[PDB]
With several copies, the nearest count.
Chain A
């Protein structure tokens, strides 16, 4: 404990080469450039309970990031954590246990959406397959939270099996966004809060099986010419599932976002379920709870008796005035059915009495 070994003096030699490399086995310290570490390893651990600062981290090879309770902040116009792939990757990406924050605090919910805010996301996957976002916390994003782009693929290779589970989204303007042709992936049990749009749906055939959206203005947006389409845009759209979710307090109660949204072409009035696309069909709709959540069924593909929108096993429950009301176009009265439902006394705009079983709600007409 005192080290009394004797020593001889140095003999004025040139000293031999002493090196102290391999100090991280696979980890990533704070204040270290992540682009040179993600290139070298396959699994990158992070320091437990650290405090990072990332901006435009380009990832080309699929790596796994165990966050261990890390905190990644950012500042600037770039996204965090840009994931660009090729078609030929056998490995997968798993981003796990990280709390992504934004360049905000109690975000500017009165500022309109524009081209300036479109690059304020935290994960932007270009064409990487089999990504996984598991147990994360995304706060205060002026643009999207994630955005899954996909370029033009061929040969019925629908694979791209993504998972977005167990996440917490607070204050993000747009939650899970997805580009066109981003088909057949799941996004469930993500607890939304204080978001303007929970799902900016462009790609179809998704599966949403447990998400909770409290105090959010919109949950399911699908129009023509939204934001966040990417290369290979609005094609083969809105075919997903939407089962057992929760969208309480979208119009009355504790909602804070405004109703206008300012799309790149026009402005529209948001609802808890806004849908307007003549070329796309409607998702399945089971087990969803709505307290004071509006629905706007404007246009789908009913052209040659090709689609019928059916609400099954859901709650409606909007009493005061027109809060939580369901709005349909008068040319779509024969195709919107509600079979199996519970409601307080909710305003139904342009829905026939024989098309709804059991007989609930107030039936009005909105010319």
Chain B
């Protein structure tokens, strides 16, 4: 590897629409929650040959 960068993108929201949106998302009842799509626990059990 020679050089490796990180590319994000800022959506140009209006600053008055911004300060309403961040003030609702700083609140503890509006916590962003996510979930794994696979949703499983890997367990690889050894089977010998034959």
Q: Is A354 an interface residue (CB 8 A)?
A: no
Q: Which chain A residues lie closer than 8 Å to B48 at the CB level?
A: 1
Q: Which chain A residues lie closer than 8 Å to B46 at the CB level?
A: 1-2, 4, 7, 10
Q: Is A31 an interface residue (CB 8 A)?
A: no
Q: Which residues 1-42 of A sit at the B interface, judged by CB distance below 8 A?
A: 1-2, 4, 7, 9-10
Q: Which chain B residues lie closer than 8 Å to A7 at the CB level?
A: 45-46
Residue tally, chain A, CB below 8 Å to B: 6
Tell me, in angstroms, the Cα distance from A10 to B48 when the chains sit together: 13
Q: B49 — nearest CB in chain A belongs to which residue?
A: A1
Q: B48 — nearest CB in chain A belongs to which residue?
A: A1
Q: Per-residue 0/1 for B31-50: is the Cβ within 8 Å of any A Cβ (1 yes, 0 no)?
A: 00000000000011110100
Q: Which chain B residues lie closer than 8 Å to A2 at the CB level?
A: 46
B50 to chain A, nearest CB (A): 10
Q: Per-residue 0/1 for A177-211: is the Cβ within 8 Å of any B Cβ (1 yes, 0 no)?
A: 00000000000000000000000000000000000
Q: Which chain A residues lie closer than 8 Å to B45 at the CB level?
A: 7, 9-10
Tell me, in angstroms, the Cα distance from A4 to B44 when the chains sit together: 11
Tell me, in angstroms, the Cα distance from A1 to B45 when the chains sit together: 12
Q: Per-residue 0/1 for A97-119: is the Cβ within 8 Å of any B Cβ (1 yes, 0 no)?
A: 00000000000000000000000
Q: A interface vs B, CB < 8 Å? A: 1-2, 4, 7, 9-10
Q: List 12 A-B contacts (CB under 8 A).
A: A1-B46, A1-B48, A2-B46, A4-B46, A7-B45, A7-B46, A9-B43, A9-B44, A9-B45, A10-B44, A10-B45, A10-B46
Closest 8 CB pairs of A and B: A9-B43, A7-B45, A10-B44, A9-B45, A9-B44, A4-B46, A7-B46, A10-B46
